[PDB]
């Protein structure tokens, strides 16, 4: 019956759970204990981007590491300029509620999500000097949480119906639907080679999908509460998850198990966005206790806290070549740390 | 000022862009945003049709109705097939929360289970929002709709079927008064937020007048904290 069939699935979890224990010969602390500590890392707010008048919900650096897109709830999506504070574009959105944004690797498009589960894709470098929607990608059933571009003709979208889809831009239909989740997806990240991507759902599970066939490869269950942020290692060989339990748990993809957890007694407040720095050593995490701590990726020790925001810290981002770390708080100011 | 011709002209574009945000930020402050709660058939479609001047938006349906030189907003959250707490942070800062309770649900049993009556289902729904950590300053403009059916149904169906401890008669003057007594006492804060109850009719046009008389109170209270008086 169902119970007998479910029992086979129940016992199927045992060997993989046992295989992880059999492969845990040495932990990260006792193999990297003989390492030089990174020390205190103090960072100062180099710029403050004070154009918005509402809560900053997302941001995304460009590939050129200078242009910067950021979307707030006041129905505006302003394309900043990190070096000299200028609003290159001010894109008026069709809906006031937006929960994500993205910037194309080439720089021609910006994609904004929303609570009306339509991924509207904008066009910047066009004739007539306007910024008009190139396409609206409807087809989801819940809400849209985070969307990234593979290239100018592909986009991967998270959703609230526990499904990640892969669209095409010339047409309007989907290509593959990454199903298999129980809780809905809140954030994802594409690998540097843009062939695999992991999504942090709301059931303490992160899955490693592939964009070719369209089904999960590895699932990780180490967290207790919902995973609220996620990001790949700069080498595409590991990924870290920040959850509501204030623990930044770093996984890997070749051993398929949890490497380490970064939790402190003083912090109880949740996590809003986790983004690795360049070289995979500074695991910057944005907590919702108004602070933004800086964890070492190999040692549990802390570093300089990037505090200074008057509200939650909604999203982070580390530039591709790694000078600046822009954080967008729910007060209307972005702060491009360095 | 060690700036090139294009760089200087680029800054002229920045502030011209900036001025259009400021000239539109004054229009957003005057705007009033109002979340709506309640079940799908508990009067959700009743009060929204009283005054509305304005299908791809299956997520959130919006109504841009206005009254007496004030543009109201109406985000009926019914299409979110997920946990309320997930996106409830996205609605922080909303001016008010219109909440509807169907008065004729005392004798109506839940569809999926033969228990947990609609008012009792809304009993925990009210607590999850009125006592929510984020929703502490957003006053709940609570309405008593479907009042044209409650008075003629309690003649043969006593209200004691819903509440095990009723201790009262079946007079609409006191039955309606008794019910709202618990609702106004469900808040953990008796001063930070207030509930503007109103026993609306099926055809009365004073509903929009009432929500106007309660939103203006929020704006006054919101401005009093800023000015420092309160």
């Amino acid at each position, epitope marked *: 019956e169902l119970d007998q069939l479910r029992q086979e699935a129940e016992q199927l979890k045992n060997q993989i759970r046992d295989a992880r224990k059999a492969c845990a010969d040495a932990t990260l602390s006792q193999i990297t204990n003989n390492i030089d500590p990174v020390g205190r890392i103090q960072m100062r707010t180099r710029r403050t981007l004070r154009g918005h008048l509402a809560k900053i919900y997302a941001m995304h650096w460009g590939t050129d590491s*200078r*242009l910067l897109v950021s979307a707030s709830q006041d129905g505006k999506l302003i394309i900043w*300029d990190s070096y000299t504070t*200028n609003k*290159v*574009h001010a894109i008026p959105l069709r809906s006031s509620w937006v929960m994500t944004c993205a910037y194309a690797p080439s*720089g021609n498009y910006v994609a904004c999500g929303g609570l009306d589960n339509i991924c509207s894709i904008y066009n910047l*470098k066009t*004739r*007539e*000097g*306007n910024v008009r929607v190139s396409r609206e990608l409807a087809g989801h059933t819940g809400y849209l949480s985070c969307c990234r571009f593979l290239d100018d003709n592909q986009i991967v979208t998270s959703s609230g119906d526990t499904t990640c889809a892969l669209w095409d831009i010339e047409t309007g239909q989907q290509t593959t639907t990454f199903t298999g989740h129980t809780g809905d997806v809140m954030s994802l990240s594409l690998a540097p080679d843009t062939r695999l991507f992991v999504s942090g759902a709301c059931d303490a599970s992160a899955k490693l999908w592939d964009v070719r066939e369209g089904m999960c490869r590895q699932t990780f269950t180490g967290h207790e509460s919902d995973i609220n942020a996620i990001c790949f290692f700069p080498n595409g060989n590991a990924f870290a998850t920040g959850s509501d339990d204030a623990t930044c748990r770093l996984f890997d993809l070749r051993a398929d198990q949890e490497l380490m957890t970064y939790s402190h007694d003083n912090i109880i407040c949740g996590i809003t966005s986790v983004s690795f720095s360049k070289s995979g050593r500074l695991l910057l995490a944005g907590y919702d206790d108004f602070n933004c701590n800086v964890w070492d990726a190999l040692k549990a020790d802390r570093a300089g806290v990037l505090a200074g925001h008057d509200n939650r810290v909604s999203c982070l981002g580390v530039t591709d070549d790694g000078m600046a770390v822009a954080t967008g708080s729910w007060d209307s100011f972005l702060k491009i740390w360095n | 000022c*060690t700036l*090139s*011709a*294009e*760089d200087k*002209a*680029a800054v*002229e*574009r920045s502030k*011209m862009i900036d001025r259009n945000l400021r000239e539109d930020g004054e229009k957003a402050a005057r705007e009033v945003k109002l979340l709506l709660l309640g079940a799908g058939e508990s009067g959700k479609s009743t009060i929204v049709k009283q005054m509305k001047i304005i299908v791809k938006t299956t997520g959130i349906v919006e109504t841009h109705f206005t009254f007496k030189d004030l543009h109201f907003k109406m985000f009926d959250v019914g299409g979110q097939r997920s946990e309320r707490k997930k996106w409830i942070h996205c609605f922080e800062g909303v001016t008010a929360i219109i909440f509807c309770v169907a008065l004729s649900d005392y004798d109506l049993v839940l569809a999926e289970d033969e228990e947990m009556n609609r008012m009792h289902e809304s009993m925990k729904l009210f607590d999850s929002i009125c006592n929510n950590k984020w929703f502490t300053d957003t006053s709940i403009i609570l309405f008593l709709n479907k009042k044209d059916l409650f008075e003629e149904k309690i003649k043969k169906s006593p209200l004691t079927i819903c509440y095990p401890e009723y201790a009262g008669s079946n007079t609409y003057e006191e039955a309606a008064a008794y019910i709202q007594c618990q609702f106004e006492d469900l808040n953990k804060r008796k001063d930070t937020k207030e509930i503007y109850t109103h026993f609306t009719c099926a055809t009365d046009t004073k509903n929009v007048q009432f929500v106007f008389d309660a939103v203006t109170d929020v704006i006054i209270k919101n401005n009093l904290k800023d000015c420092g008086l309160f």
Partner: single-chain antibody
Amino acid sequence: VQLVESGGGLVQPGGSRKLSCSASGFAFSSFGMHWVRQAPEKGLEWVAYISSGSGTIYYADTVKGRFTISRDDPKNTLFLQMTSLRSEDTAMYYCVRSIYYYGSSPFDFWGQGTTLTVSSSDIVMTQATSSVPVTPGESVSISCRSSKSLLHSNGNTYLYWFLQRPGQSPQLLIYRMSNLASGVPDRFSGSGSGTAFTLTISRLEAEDVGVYYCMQHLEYPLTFGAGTKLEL
């Protein structure tokens, strides 16, 4: 998208007329428009500049005071008023648009031109080559030396190359440098050094014959260069 303008005629010296530029196909409010003339036997000369919203306005030395420029955003037109004009202005005028932000391409599209006939400290840029012969299949190199260091302190160096095919209006080829315009093949390739600059064409066809003008944009007034024609 097009920039069509009307006006011109036979003018007695000392008169006063109006030149109207009607724009259709883009967002005129966001574009800082220019005015460029061309004598019947000379190169190009800058006339006036108006920014978006008529914020800042610049004028050439030879038309300062007696020329007035204005834009009509609701009417979507660009206006030039010339008063006390002399016989040295027997030239036809272009209507040139330009948008200024990060990564933009100024002087993208040029108008057609209205012929006006009259009956009787800045950067100096010169091109030594003039009417150089060329054959289809052989690479050609054009050098346009400047007089001031065009490399700004922010890493951006400004030099625009324009191609004027016989008959019609010039079109943009290479903005600041090493950047191709929007709608031009990859054959063109420009390089610079700060004071001496070079434009190299790998392969050329019958439609590539014309006159090449090099323009800087470091500081107003912005000066063109003497034409360098191509000979078969």
